[PDB]
């Protein structure tokens, strides 16, 4: 009658976009990058091991200076490390120990945390009193907090488990914008280098590219066969990679609006908990549940090196802003800092 013909129109529209995507692809990333020189094995040595956490680590974020990093664990502690000398600058005790995300502000003055409490607490590191105290507890999400990223010192975008992403105004605490369109729990988001857009991967095996200013999704990407666990932008901001629970990563191109390459191997059946890109966009690293952390060559989909020393599921993975290092965090309560040597 009405809803039936409306859904038929929607299906026809999605078929039209599918055939447009099919037509726009002359070839794939393989033949275009078949004659390029392979990266070769990437030997990475654990330089520092930031011991001190007493429970599984769920998230970490590198500071903008590529030296300070914040780490969140189910111990109920937010710790800021001096990755150069393995020093604990701060140890923020969280109100709720069920923390599944953390963030470092680009200015470095603020950090954020959240989790099963549905509240994104923001902490002011630089205070005249000399301690670190929570400045704003953002409430308004219904599901758990999965990821939170800082736009500026005043704007933070959070993705929750209630199929909604949101933009916040910290000084007021109200959601400036609310992003809707996902059907399953949203698990991660990655701000663009230009900061004007951000993508978001959800449990419905789809990733949606939004606009922080306009307020609604622009493009949607499908291809995965299970939950999308972590996502990350390409350094140039014109592509992103997703790490899903079906043991495959995928590289999507925003302008081409479709996937370009899949990073899968028959030896690994575990899901990718975290992904990260190298400073040049040449090495896509990916934390797996096999206790390992592969280092995929983005342009050729050939595994090159493994960060195998973790003993438990790798939950977080971050590459410095200058690319000097790669920290990886795991459920054994230890972060490890890696970088190749000649």
């Amino acid at each position, epitope marked *: 009658s009405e809803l039936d013909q409306l859904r038929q129109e929607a299906e026809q529209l999605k078929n039209q976009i599918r055939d447009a995507r099919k037509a726009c692809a002359d070839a794939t990333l393989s033949q275009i990058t078949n004659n390029i020189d392979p990266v070769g094995r990437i030997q990475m040595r654990t330089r520092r091991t930031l011991r001190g956490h007493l429970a599984k680590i769920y998230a970490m974020h590198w500071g903008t200076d590529s030296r300070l990093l914040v780490s969140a664990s189910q111990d109920g502690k937010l710790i800021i490390w001096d990755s150069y000398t393995t020093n604990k600058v701060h140890a923020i005790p969280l109100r709720s120990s069920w923390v599944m995300t953390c963030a470092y502000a680009p200015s470095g003055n603020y950090v954020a945390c959240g989790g099963l409490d549905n509240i994104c607490s923001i902490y002011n590191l*630089k205070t005249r*009193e000399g*301690n670190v105290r929570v400045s704003r507890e953002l409430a308004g999400h219904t599901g758990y907090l999965s990821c939170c990223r800082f736009l500026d010192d005043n704007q933070i975008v959070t993705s929750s488990g209630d199929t909604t992403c949101a933009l916040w105004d910290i000084e007021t605490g109200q959601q400036t914008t609310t992003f809707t369109g996902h059907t399953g729990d949203v698990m991660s988001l990655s701000l663009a280098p230009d900061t004007r857009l951000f993508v978001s991967g959800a449990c419905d095996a789809s990733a949606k590219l939004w606009d922080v200013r306009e307020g609604m999704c622009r493009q949607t990407f499908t291809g995965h066969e299970s939950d999308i666990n972590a996502i990350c932008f390409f350094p140039n901001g014109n592509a992103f990679a997703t790490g899903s629970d079906d043991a495959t990563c995928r590289l999507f191109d925003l302008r081409a609006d479709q996937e370009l390459m899949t990073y899968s191997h028959d030896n690994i059946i575990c899901g990718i908990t975290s992904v990260s890109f190298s400073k040049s966009g040449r090495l896509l690293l990916a934390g797996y549940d096999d206790f390992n952390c592969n280092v995929w060559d983005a342009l050729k989909a050939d595994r090159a090196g493994v960060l195998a020393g973790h003993d438990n599921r790798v939950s977080c993975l971050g590459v410095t802003d200058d690319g000097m290092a790669v920290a990886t965090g795991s459920w054994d309560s230890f972060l490890k800092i890696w970088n190749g040597s000649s």
Partner: single-chain antibody
Framework: VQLVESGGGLVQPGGSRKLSCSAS????????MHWVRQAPEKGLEWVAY????????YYADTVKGRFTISRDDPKNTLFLQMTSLRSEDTAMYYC??????????????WGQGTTLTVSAADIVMTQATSSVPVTPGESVSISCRSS???????????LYWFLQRPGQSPQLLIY???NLASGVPDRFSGSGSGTAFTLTISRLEAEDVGVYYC?????????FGAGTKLEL
């Protein structure tokens, strides 16, 4: 943030006196606490230091073994017990706070000072000029020099700049030779070559007059410069 000290007064030579620095308005148990004296009509001079948790304690060579410094976290009060007080200990004693971590600003707050009047290897830090007649609206550079290079292996040049306005406690301007402290205008700027250092004020104000001190923090004991005075 407030640091108020008590216990100063007239003490006969060879006697004893007890100085207490009462901290209020900040997490006193997380801040290392120093004592800095200033003899009448002279420059600053470091006295003692106790870390957070009282783990580490240092004394100047002129005072080692004669004064003892202690802190009391529950009461938020810092102590300095004085014995064998001699005529050279008459000075204006300042209570200073400093927290040490990556990117911190040590020596950022100074107490009002307490006056004690007694009746009757180290890095040498040199300021060439003692008084600079200045007028508002121009640029002045304050020059300081060190006997030993302050640029450490890790890349930090541990030199601090303090401004003591007339009848007021010294104020931190620049920490680590380039970083401008909180609450200080951007007109102040510092640069150094590791042994030779300069502090430049872009545009003088009526509140920029005072004595400017250069201090090193490379190793203990901490040594101050003679001081450069700015007058209208």
């Amino acid at each position: 943030v407030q640091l108020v000290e008590s216990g100063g007064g007239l003490v006969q030579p060879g006697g004893s006196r007890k100085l207490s620095c009462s901290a209020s308005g900040f997490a006193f148990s997380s801040f290392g606490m120093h004592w800095v004296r200033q003899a009448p009509e002279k420059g600053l001079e470091w006295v003692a230091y106790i870390s957070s948790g009282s783990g580490t304690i240092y004394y100047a060579d002129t005072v080692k073994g004669r004064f003892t410094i202690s802190r009391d976290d529950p009461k938020n009060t810092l102590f300095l017990q004085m014995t064998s007080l001699r005529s050279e200990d008459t000075a204006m004693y300042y209570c200073v706070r400093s927290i040490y971590y990556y990117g911190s600003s040590p020596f950022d707050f100074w107490g009002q000072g307490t006056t004690l009047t007694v009746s009757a290897a180290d890095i040498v830090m040199t300021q060439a000029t003692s008084s600079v007649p200045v007028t508002p609206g121009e640029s002045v550079s304050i020059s300081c020099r060190s006997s030993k290079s302050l640029l450490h292996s890790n890349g930090n040049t541990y030199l601090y700049w303090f401004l003591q306005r007339p009848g007021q406690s010294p104020q931190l301007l620049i920490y680590r030779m380039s970083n401008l402290a909180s609450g200080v205008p951007d007109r102040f700027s510092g640069s150094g070559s590791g042994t030779a250092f300069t502090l430049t004020i872009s545009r003088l104000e009526a509140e920029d007059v005072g004595v400017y001190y250069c201090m090193q923090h490379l190793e203990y004991p901490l040594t101050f410069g003679a001081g450069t005075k700015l007058e209208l």
